[PDB]
A paper describes a structure:
Respiratory complex I (NADH:ubiquinone oxidoreductase), the first enzyme of the electron-transport chain, captures the free energy released by NADH oxidation and ubiquinone reduction to translocate protons across an energy-transducing membrane and drive ATP synthesis during oxidative phosphorylation. Yarrowia lipolytica is one such model organism that is well established for studies of complex I. Complex I from Y. lipolytica contains 43 subunits, of which 14 are the core subunits required for catalytic function and 29 are supernumerary subunits with varied roles in assembly, stability, regulation, or independent metabolic function. The terminal cluster of the FeS relay is a [4Fe–4S] cluster, referred to as cluster N2 that is located at the interface of the NDUFS2 (NUCM) and NDUFS7 (NUKM) subunits. The arginine residue (NDUFS2-R121) in this motif is particularly intriguing, owing to its proximity to the N2 cluster (3.7 Å) and its unusual posttranslational modification: R121 has been shown to be the target of symmetrical ω-NG,NG dimethylation on its guanidino group.
Here, we show that mutations of this arginine residue (R121M/K) abolish the quinone-reductase activity, concomitant with disappearance of the N2 signature from the electron paramagnetic resonance (EPR) spectrum. Analysis of the cryo-EM structure of NDUFS2-R121M complex I at 3.7 Å resolution identified the absence of the cubane N2 cluster as the cause of the dysfunction, within an otherwise intact enzyme. The wild-type and R121M models were similar (with an overall RMSD of 0.31 Å), clearly signifying that global structural changes are not induced by the R121M mutation (right). The map of the wild-type complex contains a very clear map feature representing the cubane N2 cluster. While this unknown cryo-EM density appears to retain the coordination of C150 and C180, no clear connectivity is observed from the tandem cysteine side chains (C85 and C86), which would complete the ligation of the N2 cluster. The R121 mutation propagates destabilization through the NDUFS2 and NDUFS7 subunits, causing further localized disorder in the quinone-binding channel. In contrast to in the wild-type enzyme, the side chain of NDUFS2-Y144, a quinone headgroup-ligating and N2-neighboring residue, lacks any clear density, indicating considerable flexibility in the variant compared with wild-type. The flexibility of the methionine side chain is likely due to it sampling the large void created by removal of the bulky dimethylated arginine.
Residue numbers in the entry:
A (entry chain A): 1 to 14, 49 to 128
B (entry chain a): 2 to 87
C (entry chain e): 2 to 69
D (entry chain K): 1 to 89
E (entry chain N): 2403 to 2871
F (entry chain B): 71 to 210
G (entry chain J): 1 to 185
H (entry chain b): 1 to 78
The structure:
């Protein structure tokens, strides 16, 4: 019986439409989360992988920045409006 | 600071957490027997603390400077018999 | 490529027998490779612990029926 | 070695004998991957080796990406049909 | 070269509208050709079968893998010309065959996953690469999300491919549980005989082989190849089979398996029998791909199987492209368009094609008789080598099943030719539109190779007796 | 507890909301007494029928009142809600919010001064302070 | 006192069985996802039991934190109909369910051993009888743990797999966009 | 429109001024990300030559000598 | 194990009482910023307001709507409180003066801040009505989109010190606090903290749903109370992450020369005065940052969901994936990669 | 190796060593004085420790049974070191290892007592601390005049002694 | 590190001696449990003639 062990037990026991940016934000959270979680071993082995695993993780991050670039310039997460304001010109046949 | 009435509850919070941290310090110290708590202990430091428990009479973090060990030390050796994992 | 490495970043528990077996493979060609049998069996014993387990089962049988 | 095999088998059986919906199929896939990782990590401990944990972390990555792609594919199906009925794929 | 392609295309395509997609496909087509021309001299490194291990011991490079790499690129410069060069500049053929934006990226990523498999030396690289090849091909089926059947197809292929990736990983973890290794080079005659690994390795072979349609789990892949668009069917049907069969051939896993013998027999029987009543083209050609997967499965049991595999996989790929290309060209001369994605479905729509374009039918006959194994077409010299190897190693009942399967498959192969040389009312007499130049030259070149490549067989044998021996 | 935390619901404040908002203002802070206005009935105890209670609105009012969890009170702010006031003889008016809901305190005025509202709340706090919760059970 | 914590692994095995049956039997799928979360927790427990809390936490922050958030994020937005567990519809599978259970379990257990006689391959799996001694040595000098080792090998010995997982994640970005996002312009 | 894109190939420097004015949130991100690898390539040898050199590596394990054993004495029994 | 019970009860009392009076501190601080006063009538200067709101809500009906679930609306607030509370275990108030004292304390907090989302996820399923299930989705997308940005900062600073022990991370800040070399990360971490708690200027869903008939947290009784002891504790917790990551935690002026001058020996007085000084530095830092949550609330208007997801994935993430490259380069330039201890 | 997992009962062995293996005293010194004395031991037991690890390497599996003599000589060299310390430099050793125990065995918090100990043992036993593998350029961390990292609380007795010893010139 | 290095050989010597004592006493124990039987307990399951600590035992109870 440790104080962490005593505490981690005590506390508990005492039709529609959607925009596809709503769903992409979740679907894209996965890979970016796996990237930032795969970066943990680097930060905890950063000395032992001196200057080799540094370069390796940079090529890793650059490859991932590519996909981020693709996401931005597609404008995936932007919401798009249908009822546009008219910008044609007013032209009268004579 | 002008508005003392607004800072009183901050004074409650400040004093409660303050006394909580100082009291936990004294409690950890009384647990250890007059020494500050250890932290970031690895395999080696744990194995050495167990070796201390073998040399002193199981008295926690009490240290001993003797160049020669009591004869119990040779027979107090422990191995650890683990359950098969499934 | 990451073979023979432990959880602490060092040599595993059964590495040494694997080293003897790999040495004797390098010493021998496919015809003479039969010589590597006991080394391989030692490796498998370190891994899976079968013959020692059966040894202990015999000991336990003697403690179990021949006394009661 | 036991718990992983059991989750794997029961989840394969619940994948195969699901006459109800599809989210059970996704779930059974994820549970199969879980049971694999537990088998492998048990063996990696007993051998005191690292290749098992490496393949485990790799499985976690690949399974998460699997679920991402699967749940985009489902969204495409739903785009076109509007209802994911019990016996449709 | 693939990687710099995939990296550059992501940026260059995000910067580019929907209207540049054809030109971007044309660019990567020419780039792949420049690779295959200028970096092809690296075959010298594999003199006397000098084999190299790379990135530690994760990858393996020998003459087998290099030739497979060139073949996958030759496939991928022909499969790209089909998207980047419009046949006819008509509104119908714009609507029928228009590339999407992300398609080409997924193709190259699938090329990468294909090549990491064949080049793999450790199971970890295999599991990473088969997941890459698998996920990319889930998306390729699904990219045409404006169709109902493709949506159904990608969903089924996802689930039934996930199950097999589970089976593969279960097998690998078992091998590691037994032996504390992820590398097959850690096997040898001693370890094979000494340890009961037969179950643990056939489970690998099956988990890889059921991903290519091996019987009796052929139906799901056949429903997919039928339900997906024709220009996707021509890619999904080939590249995954090359990759996985090549990995299983290079690694001499199943030397004399009884299970593999049984299943391979069943594939030849199923793929020959069940394709007789089919009225649709794609199901017919899928059952053809299955029986050819049967023939190529039969050399997983040999231990000296490189020449027979390399010659058959090459002629299979060539005939497979050419026949699907003939079917694509014939859409101009039919009367009814069935879909925006599958303009041609039923074999009875090719009726009278001789009276419209006869030399298209000459190409179809050459290609069909190549599939059947009529000499002097390349298919003869491919099925001959398989018969030499299995009879040299001791499979006799299987050779008879092989002969019987070829005869039975002549019937569904000749259904096309029979209806094509039939007679038709309302023939074509003139047409001011003209098919593209490049696609005609590609089809012709594949035809001329199927026809006359028997001339070079000795030269190929000499080169093989140096670089593979 | 019931006094020091006195949370009305945002509903009922249609007309004459200015004088009620002035009781949320600096010079007369209601939050100093623990008053907090809430969007939702289910967390609230008090309803303030300010302004005109029209016939097009009374059912919505009764819904919000039944949705409140007991204990619940009602306090009628203004004349237009006590007896209809100025629009008593109109076609589109309930001549009193009594007709719909039960009222505990009636603040007079049109618009009642912020001080009148605070005094009414101090009368309501007195009502609940001379309430018998358990002593009545010890009688019952 | 000692043996109060002896059978925790068997408890987790029993609990995983329960959560699997509950995932299979639940009416509304949302409940089935909650039971999947219970199963990932039990797995994290078991991994702590055998000395890998790092993976317990990585699981809780990957699977539960993202994948299951997403599964609820989907079933909240889609009209995923169902068919509650029944007896007219699913009883027919009982003989095949039972045969498949017995065979697949006994094979999954026999497979891990190298004995030549079949029955002994299973009786070896059922030989979990003997305790494993743990000795203490003094050769490890650093504070290397499992995560540091994983970083070292993954970023030095197996760099290629890392630089391929980057492309798997590029697929995870780029495929879902292509599928969901219609680049009409 | 008022401040649309002039194109990277129709004047780099003019594009860089436009981006710093209208899209800083990308420009300064690119500048940050390029300033690391580039400086690591360029400035590192200067720091190694002029400021201070690279440290001598850490033991990492018992440094087993590369020699053959020598016969010693002292501290024997008795 | 008696003193372990004493130490737990001290901690729980201190944290929960701090939460209760953070409610009052929020209200009085916000008031004086608005040139008013109060609560200052329910106690001796309002020091009993929070317990009055509680006791009123515990004597209130437990009312459940017709078409709702009971178990989900009940356990989900309870599990939110639990998950928010267990993050307090790894939080140090002195060098090793911690209940957990794990070697993976960062990862524990990071996994528990991932478990937190489920309260908002299960809220929308408490209402079978259709709009609530989209309002919860908006409020989940903000959290999972901003947890990427909080994490990324945990990793950026752990590049400086290669250990997941919280005490070790604080002890490396004797030389300098990591808010001086990475000052912009202080803003980013504080912005994202305010977002993850769904606090203003990031209170989109509670406001957008306060207008609508639902899509909010329409609970009552005890679940209200637990949700308001889980919001005002996740606030302190996220403020603590800022403290022990960037602001030195418990660190302060070197009290070497003073303790040398005044004591002469290591007694059970010096240990107390030391733990007082350490915790007081840790506390005043939490106070200034809780003040900052309130300061921000008093000023800035609200965001919309498009502006907010655009802020995250197009402005913050690029800067961070840039910083991921500049800092390892900055260490490689100078031969200063940290060791594992 | 690994640590115990999921369950583990300590178990001893009440038996004695074989008669063909002679008897050797044990060091009997705990973590802190041992860590203080590490450098003085290594400066004196270097050849013996090296011969021990070499015979372990040459044996190739039988190290536990072939290296007993070498481990015995190592243990005796260590005992001679600590006996020389306790006989001669006791109080300074106690200052060092108590200053350590009131920290996390970080040597940075004990530099004053470490200085007094190095001085005394160098004057009497002729044993100096040395960190090898360094260049002549690198400055060893225990001799830096104004280090970046300093203890939370400099120990009291250590500080009084350091000041009195500078006044007495002993340092 | 260099301090923990200068200490390693000493401590591992201790552990080798206790390893020897226990691994030999275990065999002298089984000899007495296997008195009247032709079961060689000294016969090593390893075919090489190296020392090998048990790595297994019987549960104490
Ligand atoms: C992936 C989805 C997730 C679910 C996974 C489920 C668990 C997976 C189980 C294992 C993996 C699946 C294997 C797929 C079937 C193919 C197995 C195979 O082909 O191996 C055969 C192989 C021998 O074949 P071969 O090497 O070709 O020829 C030389 C023969 N001396 O090797 C063998 O000889 C096989 C060994 C023979 C023993 C087989 C064990 C059967 C025991 C079952 C007994 C059941 C009891 C009786 C009936 C009960 C019903 C009441
Ligand atoms: C010293 C010189 C520094 C060079 C700075 C580079 C200037 C960048 C120009 C710019 O402002 O980007 C604008 C560009 C297009 O944006 P826009 O015109 O507004 O249209 C998009 C909506 N349809 O935006 C884009 O095309 C997308 C840019 C996304 C950038 C976010 C990721 C930043 C990553 C930082 C790492 C830098 C290294 C990346 C290189 C990859 C190499 C493989
Ligand atoms: C990306 C672009 C980054 C390039 C930045 C280059 C800036 C060059 C600044 C040069 C200042 C040199 C001062 C110096 O001499 O530093 C030495 C000092 C070492 O400390 P010391 O106790 O003496 O130990 C040395 C043992 N050999 O201390 C050091 O070694 C470290 C000095 C760090 C100087 C600041 C570097 C960061 C500059 C801001 C960029 C990051 C912003 C985010
Ligand atoms: C290679 C591109 C394939 C793409 C498809 C085109 C077919 C090209 C075949 C050339 C193979 C070769 O010349 O090689 C012979 C190979 C081994 O030689 P190698 O190590 O690969 O060196 C080759 C170096 N090149 C690439 C610079 C030339 O033997 C084989 O088993 C191949 C069997 C293939 C049978 C198919 C015959 C087709 C007729 C070809 C009429 C020109
Ligand atoms: C509890 C003791 C009790 O029994 O209460 C006694 C009193 C009465 O409480 P009160 O009426 O609400 O406050 C008075 C509010 N005047 C308005 C009315 O408590 C208090 O004032 C505060 C108790 C000390 C606060 C501790 C912090 C003017």
């Amino acid at each position: 019986m440790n104080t962490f062990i005593i505490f981690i037990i005590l506390i508990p026991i005492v039709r529609l439409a959607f925009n596809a940016a709503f769903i992409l934000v979740a679907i894209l959270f996965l890979p970016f989360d796996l990237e930032i979680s795969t970066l943990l071993p680097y930060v905890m082995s950063i000395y032992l992988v001196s200057n080799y695993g540094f370069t390796i993780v940079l090529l890793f991050l650059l490859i991932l920045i590519i996909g981020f670039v693709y996401e931005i310039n597609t404008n995936a997460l932007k919401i798009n409006k249908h009822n546009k304001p008219n910008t044609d010109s007013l032209i009268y046949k004579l | 600071a002008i508005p003392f009435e607004a800072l009183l509850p901050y004074g409650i919070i400040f004093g409660l957490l303050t006394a909580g941290g100082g009291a936990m310090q004294v409690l950890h110290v009384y647990r250890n027997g007059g020494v500050r708590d250890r932290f970031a202990i690895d395999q080696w430091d744990s194995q050495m603390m167990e070796r201390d428990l073998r040399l002193n009479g199981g008295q926690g973090r009490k240290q001993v400077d003797q160049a020669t060990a009591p004869e119990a030390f040779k027979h107090n050796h422990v191995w650890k018999s683990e359950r098969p994992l499934i | 490529t990451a073979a023979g490495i432990s959880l602490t970043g060092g040599r595993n528990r059964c590495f040494s027998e694997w080293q003897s077996f790999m040495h004797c493979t390098a010493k021998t060609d496919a015809k003479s490779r039969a010589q590597c049998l006991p080394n391989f069996e030692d490796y498998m014993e370190c891994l899976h612990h079968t013959k020692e387990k059966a040894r202990l089962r015999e000991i336990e049988s003697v403690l179990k029926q021949k006394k009661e | 070695m036991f718990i992983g095999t059991i989750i794997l088998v029961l989840s394969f059986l619940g994948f195969v004998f699901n006459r109800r919906n599809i989210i059970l199929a996704f779930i059974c896939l994820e549970t199969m991957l879980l049971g694999i990782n537990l088998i492998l990590l048990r063996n990696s401990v007993l051998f005191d080796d690292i290749s098992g944990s490496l393949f485990a972390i790799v499985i976690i990555i690949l399974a998460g990406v699997e679920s991402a792609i699967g749940l985009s594919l489902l969204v495409s199906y739903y785009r076109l049909r509007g209802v994911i009925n019990s016996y449709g794929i | 070269m693939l990687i710099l392609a995939i990296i550059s295309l992501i940026t260059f395509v995000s910067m580019s509208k929907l209207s540049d997609n054809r030109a971007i496909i044309r660019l990567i087509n020419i780039y792949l050709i420049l690779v295959l021309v200028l970096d092809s001299f690296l075959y010298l490194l594999f003199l006397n079968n000098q084999t190299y291990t790379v990135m530690g011991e994760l990858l393996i490079f020998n003459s087998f893998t290099f030739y497979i790499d060139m073949l996958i690129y030759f496939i991928m410069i022909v499969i790209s010309s089909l998207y980047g060069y419009n046949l006819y500049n008509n509104n119908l053929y714009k609507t029928l065959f228009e590339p999407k934006k992300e398609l080409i990226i997924l193709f190259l990523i699938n090329i990468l996953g294909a090549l990491l498999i064949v080049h793999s030396n450790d199971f970890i690289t295999l599991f990473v690469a088969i997941e890459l090849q698998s996920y990319s091909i889930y998306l390729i089926t699904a990219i045409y999300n404006s169709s109902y059947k493709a949506s159904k197809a990608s969903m089924l292929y996802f689930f039934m491919g996930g199950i097999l990736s589970i089976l593969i990983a279960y097998s690998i973890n078992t091998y590691y549980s037994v032996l504390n290794s992820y590398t097959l080079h850690s096997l040898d005659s001693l370890i094979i005989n000494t340890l009961d690994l037969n179950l643990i390795l056939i489970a690998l072979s099956l988990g890889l082989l059921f991903k290519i349609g091996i019987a009796p789990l052929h139906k799901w892949l056949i429903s997919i190849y039928e339900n997906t668009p024709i220009l996707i069917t021509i890619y999904i049907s080939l590249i995954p089979k090359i990759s996985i069969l090549s990995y299983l051939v290079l690694s001499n896993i199943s030397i004399n398996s009884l299970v593999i013998s049984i299943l391979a027999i069943l594939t030849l029987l199923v793929g020959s029998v069940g394709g007789l009543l089919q009225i649709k083209i794609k199901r017919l050609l899928a059952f053809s791909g299955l029986t050819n997967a049967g023939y190529m499965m039969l050399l997983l049991l040999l231990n000296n199987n490189e020449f027979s595999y390399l010659y058959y996989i090459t002629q299979y790929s060539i005939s497979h492209l050419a026949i699907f290309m003939i079917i694509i060209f014939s859409i101009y001369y039919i009367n009814y368009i069935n879909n925006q994605y599958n303009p041609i479905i039923y074999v009875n729509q090719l009726k009278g094609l001789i009276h419209d374009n006869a030399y298209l039918v000459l190409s179809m006959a050459i290609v069909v008789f190549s599939f059947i194994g009529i000499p002097p077409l390349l298919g003869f010299f491919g099925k001959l080598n398989i018969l030499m190897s299995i009879l040299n190693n001791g499979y006799y009942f299987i050779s008879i099943v092989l002969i019987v399967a070829s005869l039975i498959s002549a019937l569904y192969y000749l259904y096309l030719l029979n209806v094509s040389i039939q007679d038709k009312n309302n023939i074509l007499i003139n047409s001011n539109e003209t098919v593209s130049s490049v696609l005609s030259y590609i089809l012709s070149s594949l035809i001329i190779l199927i026809t006359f490549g028997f001339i070079y067989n000795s030269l190929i044998i000499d080169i093989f007796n140096v670089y593979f021996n | 507890a019931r006094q020091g935390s006195f949370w009305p619901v945002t509903f009922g404040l249609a007309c004459c909301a200015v004088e009620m908002m002035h009781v949320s203002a600096p010079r007369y802070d209601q939050d100093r007494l623990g008053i907090i206005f809430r969007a939702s009935p289910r967390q609230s105890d008090i309803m303030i029928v300010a302004g005109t209670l029209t016939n097009k609105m009374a059912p919505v009012l009764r819904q919000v009142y039944d949705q409140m969890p007991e204990p619940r009170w009602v306090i009628s702010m203004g004349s237009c809600a006590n007896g209809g006031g100025y629009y008593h003889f109109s076609y589109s008016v309930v001549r009193g919010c009594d007709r719909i809901v039960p009222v505990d305190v009636y603040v007079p005025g049109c618009p009642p001064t912020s001080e009148a509202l605070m005094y009414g709340v101090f009368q309501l706090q007195r009502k609940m302070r001379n309430t018998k919760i358990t002593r009545m059970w010890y009688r019952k | 006192m000692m043996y109060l914590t002896y059978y925790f692994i068997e408890i987790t095995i029993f609990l995983a069985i329960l959560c699997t049956i509950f995932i299979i039997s639940a009416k509304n799928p949302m409940v089935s996802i909650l039971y999947m979360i219970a199963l990932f927790v039990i797995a994290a427990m078991y991994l702590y039991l055998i000395g890998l809390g790092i993976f317990s936490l990585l699981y809780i922050m990957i699977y539960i934190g993202a994948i299951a958030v997403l599964f609820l994020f989907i079933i909240t937005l889609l009209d995923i109909n169902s068919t509650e567990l029944s007896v007219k519809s699913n009883i027919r599978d009982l003989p095949l369910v039972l045969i498949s259970l017995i065979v697949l379990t006994i094979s999954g257990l026999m497979i891990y051993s190298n004995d030549s006689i079949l029955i002994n391959k299973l009786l070896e799996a059922f030989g979990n009888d003997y305790n494993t001694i743990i000795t203490q040595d003094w050769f490890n000098i650093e504070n290397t743990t499992l995560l540091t080792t994983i970083g070292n090998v993954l970023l030095t010995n197996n760099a290629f797999i890392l630089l391929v997982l980057a492309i798997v994640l590029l697929l995870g970005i780029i495929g879902p966009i292509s599928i969901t996002m219609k680049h009409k312009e | 429109m008022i401040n649309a894109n002039p194109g990277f190939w129709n004047g780099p420097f003019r594009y860089l001024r436009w981006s710093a004015h209208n899209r800083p949130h990308l420009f300064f991100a690119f500048a940050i990300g390029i300033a690391g690898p580039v400086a690591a390539l360029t400035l590192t040898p200067l720091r190694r030559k002029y400021l201070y050199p690279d440290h001598s590596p850490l033991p990492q394990s018992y440094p087993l000598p590369q020699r053959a054993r020598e016969q010693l004495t002292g501290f024997d029994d008795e | 194990m008696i003193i372990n019970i004493v130490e737990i009860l001290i901690f729980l009392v201190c944290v929960l009482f701090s939460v209760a009076y953070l409610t009052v501190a929020e209200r009085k601080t916000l008031a004086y910023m608005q040139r008013r006063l109060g609560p200052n009538f329910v106690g001796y200067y309002g020091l009993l307001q929070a317990f009055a709101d509680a006791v009123k809500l515990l004597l209130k009906e437990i009312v459940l709507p017709k078409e709702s679930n009971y178990i989900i609306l009940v356990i989900s607030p309870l599990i939110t409180l639990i998950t928010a509370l267990i993050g307090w275990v790894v939080i140090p108030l002195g060098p090793g003066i911690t209940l957990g004292e794990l070697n993976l304390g960062i990862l524990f907090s990071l996994a528990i801040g991932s478990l937190g989302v489920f309260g908002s996820l299960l809220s929308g399923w408490s209402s079978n009505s259709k709009y609530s299930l989209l309002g919860s989705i908006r409020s989940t997308a903000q959290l999972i989109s901003y947890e990427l940005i909080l994490t990324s900062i945990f990793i950026i600073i752990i590049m400086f010190v290669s250990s997941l022990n919280i005490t070790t991370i604080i002890e490396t800040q004797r030389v300098v606090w990591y808010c001086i070399p990475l000052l912009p990360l202080l803003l980013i971490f504080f912005i994202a903290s305010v977002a993850e708690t769904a606090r203003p200027p990031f209170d989109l869903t509670e406001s957008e749903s306060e207008l609508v008939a639902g899509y909010f947290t329409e609970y009552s009784g005890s679940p209200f109370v637990f949700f308001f002891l889980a919001e005002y504790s996740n606030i302190i917790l996220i403020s603590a992450f800022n403290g022990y990551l960037l602001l030195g935690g418990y660190l302060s002026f070197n009290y070497s020369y003073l303790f040398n001058i005044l004591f002469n020996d290591y007694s059970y007085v010096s240990f107390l005065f030391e733990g007082l000084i350490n915790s007081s530095a840790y506390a005043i830092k939490l106070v200034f940052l809780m003040f900052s949550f309130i300061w921000v609330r008093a000023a800035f208007p609200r965001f919309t969901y498009d502006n907010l997801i655009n802020f995250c994935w197009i402005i913050l993430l690029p800067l961070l994936f840039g910083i991921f490259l500049i800092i390892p380069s900055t260490l490689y330039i100078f031969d200063s990669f940290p060791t594992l201890i | 190796p690994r640590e115990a997992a999921a369950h583990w009962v300590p178990f001893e062995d009440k038996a004695n060593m074989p008669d063909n293996v002679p008897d050797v005293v044990e060091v009997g010194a705990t973590s802190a004085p041992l860590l203080s004395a590490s450098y003085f031991i290594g400066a004196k037991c270097k050849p013996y420790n090296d011969d021990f690890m070499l015979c372990r390497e040459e044996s190739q599996g039988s190290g536990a049974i072939d290296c007993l003599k070498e481990g015995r000589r190592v243990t005796r060299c260590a005992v001679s070191v600590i006996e020389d310390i306790n006989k001669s430099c006791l109080d300074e050793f106690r200052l060092h290892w108590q200053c350590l125990e009131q920290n996390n065995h970080q040597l940075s918090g004990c530099r004053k007592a470490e200085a007094l100990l190095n001085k005394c043992v160098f004057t009497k036993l002729n044993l100096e601390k040395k960190i090898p593998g360094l260049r002549p350029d690198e400055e060893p961390v225990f001799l830096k005049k104004d280090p970046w990292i300093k203890p939370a609380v400099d120990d009291f007795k250590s500080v009084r002694a350091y000041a009195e010893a500078k006044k007495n010139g002993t340092l | 590190l260099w301090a923990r290095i200068y200490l390693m050989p000493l401590l591992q010597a201790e552990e080798d001696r206790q390893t020897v004592r226990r691994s030999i006493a275990q065999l002298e124990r089984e000899k007495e449990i296997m008195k009247g039987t032709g079961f060689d307990v000294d016969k090593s399951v390893y075919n090489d003639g190296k020392f090998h600590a048990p790595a297994l035992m019987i549960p104490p109870k």
